[PDB]
Design a protein around this ligand. Structure first.
Ligand SMILES: CC(=S)N[C@H]1[C@H](O[C@H]2[C@H](O)[C@H]3N=C(C)S[C@H]3O[C@@H]2CO)O[C@H](CO)[C@@H](O)[C@@H]1O
Length: 539
C-alpha cells in the first residue's frame, strides 16, 4: 500500500523575506532583510502507513524532503521568492506518494508579490483616463496625510498617473544636520528615534508607523508583514505595474543634510544607503531628490554654499551610476528625478544642462510664487505668465522654464508643476482698478490645515458661492477668488489654468505635468492635467 493521506497541521501560514519587527522604533531594528523566508509546516497522519519519505511541495515542486519517522512531522525550509503557494505535504514509499490537500501559504516580499492588487474605484470627481499621451502625469502623496487629512493610498486615483512620488524619505542626522525639523513639534525627535544606531547621512523612514504599520485597506490582518503606506504601495504596484512609484528624499524640512554632501565620504554613504533602500523596498522605481535648495534660501537661514551646484551635479551623476548598476542586477528600469525651484535666481545656481544627462525628469516647482509669507507683494502663486498689471513679474512658470531652456536643458526633461491648493491673505486693502493684487495685506487667509494655505477641494466646496468674487486672469492664466468685505484673497490653479499649462507643455514639447499634493484635489485638477496633455478618456 502507498502511504496514508497526511493532514496539514494548523499553524502560521504567512512568512516574510523582509521581516518587520513589530516591537522596534529604530529603523535598523525595524527591518530585517533575509536572503529567503524561513518557512514551517507540520502534519499528522491519522490513517495508514506513514511512508518512508516526507516532502513539502509548493505548486507540486518539492521545497523540502526528509525521512518520515512518525505519525507527526515538521519541516523547516527556505523559500526565496515571494508569492502565494499551494503547499502540500506528501508521504512517499516504494509503492507511491500520497499528497495532502493543498493549504495556501504566503511568502511576503517588498514588491508586493504576495498581495492582492489594490484596484479601487475612483472617488469624488475623478474620471478615468488612459496613460497614452506619452507625457508625465505625476502627483505627490504625503506620508503624514493618513492622519488629520485622512487621505490614504487606497484613495489615490492611481490609473490617472504615470508617476507617484512619496513625500518624504528623511536622511539621518541630529544637531546641525536636521535643524529645520526642530520647527515642527516632535518631528526632530521622531527622526532621532528612527535613526538610533544608524550613521548620519543614511536614509531612513520618518514615521515607521504610518509607513509600515497603520492598518489600511487590504493590509488589516495582524499577521500581514507590511501595512501602512508601504504595504498599500506594494498592492498598488500589483494593480498598476507601469505606475512609477518614487521615494522623494528631502522636501522643505528634510533638505538640511544635502548641504553637507560636498564631503564625498558623506555623499558616498548617502548614495550607498539609497541603493540599500531600493534593494530593501522593491516596490520603488528609483529616486526623487528634492534638495530645497542648492545655494540655500530654504528652511534653514544658515545653510547654502557656492559649492552646492557642483555637489548637486556630482550627486546626480553618482546616483545614476548606482541606479545603472542596480538596473543591470535586476533587469528593471530605474528613474532619477528631482524637484527644483522654479525661480531663475535659484535655477542659476546649478548647471541643469549638465545634470540632465543623469536625470530622467526635472520636476519644476512652478508654485509658491507668492503667499502669506509676504504681506506686501501680492501676486499669482502658480501662474503661467505675468499678469497685465505687472508684465515684468519675476516668478512665473514661463520664466522658470525659460531659465532651464536657456541653460541648454532639453525641453522633454521638464515637467511643469500645478498646485492642488491655494495660498492667500486676509485684509487686502489699498488696491486700484479692481485688482486686489496691487494692494497690501494684514495676515494669512484662514487655512484648511495651516494658515495661508487652502486645499483646492475647499476652495471649490466653500469659496465659490456667497460674497466670493471669482476671476479668471487670461493673460497670467490664473484664477483667484476675493471676498471684499474681509479683503480675503486666494490664488490657486483650476481646471482652466491647468489646461493652459498642459497646452503649454504640448506646444513647447515639455515632459508633462505633476502636482502637489494629491490629497487636496477633488478630481478637478488631475482630470484637467490628464485631458490637457491629451490622454484618452475611459478605462
Ligand atoms: C503648504 C504646505 S502643504 N506646506 C507643506 C510643505 O510642502 C512643500 C514641499 O515641501 C515643497 N516640496 C515639494 C516636492 S512640493 C513643495 O511645496 C510644498 C507646499 O509649498 O512641505 C512640508 C514638509 O517638507 C510640510 O511641513 C508643509 O506642511
Amino acid at each position: 500500500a502507498a502511504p496514508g493521506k497526511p493532514t496539514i497541521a494548523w499553524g502560521n501560514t504567512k512568512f516574510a523575506i523582509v521581516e518587520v519587527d513589530q516591537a522596534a522604533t529604530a529603523y535598523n531594528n525595524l527591518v530585517k532583510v533575509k536572503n529567503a523566508a524561513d518557512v514551517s509546516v507540520s502534519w499528522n497522519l491519522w490513517n495508514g502507513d506513514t511512508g518512508t519519505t516526507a516532502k513539502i511541495l509548493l505548486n507540486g515542486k518539492e521545497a523540502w524532503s526528509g525521512p518520515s519517522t512518525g505519525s507527526s512531522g515538521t519541516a523547516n525550509f527556505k523559500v526565496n521568492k515571494g508569492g502565494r503557494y499551494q503547499m502540500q505535504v506528501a508521504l512517499c514509499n516504494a509503492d507511491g506518494c500520497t499528497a495532502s490537500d493543498a493549504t495556501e501559504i504566503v511568502v511576503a516580499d517588498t514588491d508586493g508579490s504576495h498581495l492582492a492588487p489594490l484596484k479601487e474605484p475612483l472617488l469624488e470627481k475623478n474620471k478615468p483616463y488612459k496613460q497614452n499621451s506619452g507625457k508625465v502625469v505625476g502627483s505627490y502623496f504625503v506620508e503624514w496625510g493618513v492622519y488629520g487629512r485622512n487621505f490614504t493610498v487606497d484613495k489615490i486615483p492611481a490609473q490617472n498617473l504615470t508617476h507617484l512620488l512619496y513625500g518624504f524619505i528623511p536622511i539621518c542626522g541630529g544637531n546641525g544636520i536636521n535643524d529645520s525639523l526642530k520647527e515642527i513639534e516632535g518631528s526632530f525627535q521622531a527622526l532621532q528615534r528612527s535613526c538610533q544606531g544608524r550613521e548620519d547621512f543614511k536614509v531612513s523612514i520618518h514615521d515607521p508607523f504610518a509607513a509600515l504599520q497603520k492598518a489600511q485597506k487590504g493590509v488589516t490582518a495582524w499577521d500581514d508583514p507590511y501595512k501602512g503606506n508601504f504595504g498599500q504601495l506594494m498592492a498598488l504596484k500589483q494593480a498598476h505595474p507601469d505606475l512609477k512609484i518614487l521615494p522623494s528624499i528631502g522636501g522643505w524640512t528634510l533638505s538640511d543634510p544635502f548641504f553637507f554632501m560636498g564631503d564625498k565620504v558623506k555623499r558616498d554613504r548617502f548614495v550607498g544607503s539609497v541603493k540599500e533602500f531600493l534593494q530593501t523596498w522593491k516596490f520603488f522605481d528609483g529616486v526623487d531628490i528634492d534638495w530645497e535648495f542648492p545655494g540655500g534660501k530654504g528652511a534653514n537661514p544658515n545653510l547654502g554654499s557656492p559649492q552646492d551646484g557642483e555637489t548637486y551635479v556630482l550627486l546626480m551623476k553618482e546616483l545614476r551610476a548606482m541606479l545603472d548598476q542596480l538596473s543591470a542586477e535586476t533587469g528593471r528600469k530605474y528613474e532619477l528625478t528631482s524637484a527644483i525651484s522654479a525661480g531663475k535666481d535659484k535655477i542659476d545656481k546649478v548647471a541643469y544642462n549638465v545634470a540632465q544627462n543623469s536625470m530622467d525628469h526635472i520636476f519644476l516647482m512652478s508654485y509658491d510664487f507668492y503667499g502669506a509669507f509676504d504681506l506686501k507683494n501680492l501676486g499669482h502663486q502658480t501662474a503661467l505668465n505675468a499678469p497685465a498689471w505687472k508684465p515684468d513679474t519675476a516668478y512665473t512658470t514661463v520664466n522658470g522654464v525659460n531659465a532651464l531652456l536657456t541653460q541648454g536643458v532639453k525641453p522633454g526633461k521638464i515637467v511643469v508643476g500645478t498646485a492642488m491648493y491655494g495660498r492667500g491673505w486676509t485684509g487686502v486693502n489699498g488696491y486700484q482698478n479692481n485688482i486686489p493684487f496691487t494692494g497690501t495685506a494684514t495676515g494669512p487667509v484662514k487655512g484648511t490645515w495651516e494658515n495661508g494655505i487652502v486645499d483646492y477641494r475647499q476652495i471649490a466646496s466653500q469659496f465659490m458661492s456667497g460674497e466670493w468674487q471669482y476671476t479668471y486672469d487670461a493673460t497670467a492664466e490664473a484664477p483667484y477668488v476675493f471676498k471684499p468685505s474681509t479683503g480675503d484673497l486666494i490664488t490657486f490653479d483650476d481646471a482652466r489654468s491647468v489646461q493652459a499649462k498642459g497646452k503649454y507643455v504640448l506646444d513647447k514639447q515639455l515632459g508633462g505635468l505633476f502636482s502637489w499634493e494629491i490629497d487636496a484635489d477633488n478630481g478637478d485638477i488631475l482630470n484637467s492635467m490628464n485631458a490637457s496633455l491629451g490622454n484618452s478618456a475611459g478605462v
